[PDB]
Design a protein around this nucleic acid. Structure first.
Ligand code: CA
Length: 615
DNA sequence: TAGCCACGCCTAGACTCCTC
DNA sequence: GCTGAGGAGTCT
DNA sequence: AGGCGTG
């Protein structure tokens, strides 16, 4: 008796966002009516709207619409939607380019024929450039082309962009808490649900926690609209870059740079600046800064390094937005000054201020440190003593390396075809470790989530849980996660350190039994093949190791989540384990990886780098 | 005879968009 | 240069 | 678009 998957999900999105009065303040009466109009539709009207909401925004020939699960004849349904203001008809189709677009290339030929002034052959794009040229000069003949084009195209529908824009903004608000937020969304088509959410949201069961909110994110409807707009801008700039369209990207960035300067002094920014970091990420400012970051990337790719440096300096000169990015910025400033602008004095000042910055961390911190020693210990630099300046000797302990071979066929090897990691897994099986998981950071991260679940979903921290569909407290990736739960963390971390390998087995099984399936960002239910396999692994790893790992992930998940080895292997009977990073022929350790290995060693654990050489 | 042309049919491969 | 896989309809 | 037959 249920709705189809896509309608359930879409329904869960609206429900979630509607139950917040905070959030509905950011919609006017007109806009809210659109939501009611939607609920007012029939099950069929609702189904059809969502289908088309999920598809690209443009005209669709009536003969290209078919959803048998909806209705064998869609016209009463289209009618309902056109009545309610959601859909529109070939009647409202008025722009020429649009009608030309909706026509098949054959149909564009026929229309090229029954119009004498046209050269009947050429690509679909060609004919269109032509027909549009024609109508721009001799306008009245253009109206005739339009008329016949339309009649040729037949009956058509298109989603109405006004009601659609409302749902985008509803989807956006749903997604600061869930969707887009868990690594920002591509959001093509104008703002649909992600495939994953569309398919699963309706079925997802979330962890239980208590919604408690005390602070507004957006000033008013206008604020939310400015944000939305920055979001769309950023997404486009990203997409440009993803497609190697750097000149386009540049222009957009520049344009976005101006807008953000036009918004300076605006009263809303006063309140934004005053939000806690875990909220401040949801402000126009944050998003523009994020844009300004892509801008340096863009400049750098166009080898415009002087400019890149200027932007980097701007970025670094403020502490309001994206403090987590400073490590990357500093590192990047340094690299540019050193390698491209070849300017060794500032390179040193840069490195020093960088290292003096409590915001730079793990990977980038190390990368800046290494740059300092490479420099201070160099001839063409020796003409100074400004890098002897009390640099903490932050060395990283070396780790046992090893090598194996595998016949080479993402590099695929033949053993059956397999990855570099699978090849190592094989080696470690013949080396006596009957068990193994290739899970990089998710193995540790799901252990951490299993062991600290109840702390992670703890009550008592205002603003971290704003609605029903979160898979994590909003501060999880903030310095504040730890600090806002200091007593409880220190407790549990300690209890883990001291725990016997049966305490661990039991704790894990507690969470597993009460939460299995519940959606939480740290935990992958399928990561371990069973609860027993999770139990075996915590027995081998033991209290002191697990405790150290959890401390890192809870102190600074943001800068620690990356770098954990590819592999965890263990011998069933000896209980001896090994944490292994697999490196194929052409890759070395990243800074994050070396920091993690040293740290795992310190916690007393067998860590190995395993290089595969190919035949 | 080889070698050049003219003409139209048919489809592989790419591409877009959609689906779960 | 990737972060989903596969199918259908289209274009040329 | 471009391979292919056909005449
Ligand atoms: Ca690896």
């Amino acid at each position: 008796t249920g709705h189809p998957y896509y309608l359930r999900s879409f329904l869960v999105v609206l429900k979630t966002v509607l139950e917040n009065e905070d959030d509905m303040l950011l919609f006017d009466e007109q806009e809210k009516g659109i939501v009611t109009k939607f609920y007012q539709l029939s099950a069929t009207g609702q189904k059809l709207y969502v289908r088309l909401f999920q598809r690209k925004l443009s005209w669709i020939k009536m003969t290209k619409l078919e959803y048998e699960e909806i209705a064998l004849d869609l016209t009463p349904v289209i009618e309902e939607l056109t009545n309610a203001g959601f859909l529109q008809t070939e009647s409202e189709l008025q722009e020429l380019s649009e009608v030309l677009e909706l026509l098949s290339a054959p149909e564009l030929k026929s229309l090229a024929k029954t119009f004498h002034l046209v050269n009947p052959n050429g690509q679909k794009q060609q004919l269109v450039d032509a027909f549009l040229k024609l109508a721009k000069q001799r306008s009245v003949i253009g109206a005739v082309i339009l008329k016949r084009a339309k009649a040729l195209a037949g009956q058509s529908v298109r989603i109405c962009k006004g009601p659609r824009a409302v749902f985008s903004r509803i989807l956006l608000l749903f997604s600061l808490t869930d969707s887009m937020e868990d690594e920002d969304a591509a959001c093509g088509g104008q703002g649909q649900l992600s495939t994953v959410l569309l398919v699963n949201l309706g079925r997802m069961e979330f962890p239980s926690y208590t919604i408690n909110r005390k602070t507004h994110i957006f000033q008013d409807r206008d604020d939310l609209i400015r944000y939305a707009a920055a979001t769309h801008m950023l997404s486009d700039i990203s997409s440009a870059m993803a497609n190697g369209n750097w000149e386009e990207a540049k222009e957009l960035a520049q344009c976005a740079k101006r807008d953000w300067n036009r918004l300076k002094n605006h009263p809303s920014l006063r309140c934004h600046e005053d939000l806690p970091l875990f909220l401040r990420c949801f402000t126009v400012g944050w998003i523009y800064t994020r844009i300004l970051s892509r801008f340096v990337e863009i400049l750098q790719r166009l080898h415009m390094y002087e400019e890149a440096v200027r932007e980097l300096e701007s970025l670094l000169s403020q502490r309001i937005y994206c403090p987590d990015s400073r490590g990357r910025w500093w590192d990047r400033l340094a690299l540019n000054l050193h390698q491209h602008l070849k300017r060794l004095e500032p390179t040193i000042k840069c490195i020093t201020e960088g290292l003096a910055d409590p915001e730079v961390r793990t990977g980038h911190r190390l990368s800046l440190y290494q740059r300092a020693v490479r420099l201070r210990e160099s001839p063409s630099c020796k003409k100074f003593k400004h890098l002897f300046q009390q640099l903490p000797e932050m060395a990283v302990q070396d780790v046992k390396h090893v090598t194996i071979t595998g016949r080479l066929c993402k590099s695929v090897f033949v053993m059956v075809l397999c990855s570099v990691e699978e090849l190592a897994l094989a080696h470690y099986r013949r080396s006596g470790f009957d068990q193994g998981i290739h899970g990089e950071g998710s193995t540790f991260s799901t252990l951490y989530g299993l062991l600290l679940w109840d702390i992670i979903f703890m009550d008592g921290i205002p603003d971290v849980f704003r609605n029903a569909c979160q898979a994590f407290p909003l501060d999880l990736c903030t310095d504040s996660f730890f600090t806002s739960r200091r007593p409880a963390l220190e407790a549990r971390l300690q209890l883990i350190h001291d725990a016997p390998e049966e305490s661990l087995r039991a704790w894990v099984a507690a969470t597993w039994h009460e939460q299995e399936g519940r959606v939480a960002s740290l935990v992958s239910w399928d990561r371990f093949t069973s609860l027993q396999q999770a139990q075996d692994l915590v027995s081998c790893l033991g209290g002191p190791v697990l405790s150290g790992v959890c401390r890192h992930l809870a102190a600074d998940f943001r800068h620690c989540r990356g770098g954990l080895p590819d592999l965890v292997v263990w011998n069933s009977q000896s209980r001896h384990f090994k944490l292994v990073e697999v490196k194929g022929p052409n890759d070395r350790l990243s800074h994050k990886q070396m920091i993690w290995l040293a740290e795992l060693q310190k916690l007393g654990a067998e860590v190995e780098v395993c290089h595969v050489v190919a035949v």
